[PDB]
Amino acid sequence: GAMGSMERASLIQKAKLAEQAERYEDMAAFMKGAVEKGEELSCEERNLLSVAYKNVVGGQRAAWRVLSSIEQKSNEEGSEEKGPEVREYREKVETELQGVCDTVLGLLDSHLIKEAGDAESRVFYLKMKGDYYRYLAEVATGDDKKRIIDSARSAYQEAMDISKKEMPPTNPIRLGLALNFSVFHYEIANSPEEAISLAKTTFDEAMADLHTLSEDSYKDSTLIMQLLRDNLTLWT
């Protein structure tokens, strides 16, 4: 690790600076360094880790979709042959994306998940594990595609089971997990009914628990509830 010589606190400080500067690749590298110190992450630190990689992989996924679209068009009838370049460059971006996903999955496996005993931390990491397997699934086309999809499903399901037992239906982690697992069902598992059912039930159960919340908690929960509604609107 190129970050092995830097203090944990300095890596966290720099991650925050990198965020302010919209330098998400640097932010992710700093957070990887922090994780690799081997201490558990606080809530704030878990959020820095997730923001960093979400932004990096988000950019890769957007690029991959642009390139995949061009490639798909090149394989329509009447399309002029332009050689291997579009495929090569899509493969290049794809490989980089896979690399980032493998890096995140690696941090989760060594050793964030196994050390996470509190529900909020364990659910957060298992949601991340489902998310990064989901990104792998989006680009998977070969022998392991079903196993990649199942790895996402398994991680999300474990997270769901803990979240339903240990957290209130308005908990933002529980909500965000449900949002993303619903998208997994719709976009990856070819299960739009499961996606819709999950989003609806999650929204309605949260609605019924809002009365217990402070103004600030209410704000946090309703923000994610609106994303559930936005998806339901898209799908129905």
């Binding site: 998310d131 965000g176 949002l179 719709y186 994610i224």
Partner: peptide, 5 residues
């Protein structure tokens, strides 16, 4: 594309 967090 649907929302995720």
């Amino acid at each position: 594309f649907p929302a995720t967090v």
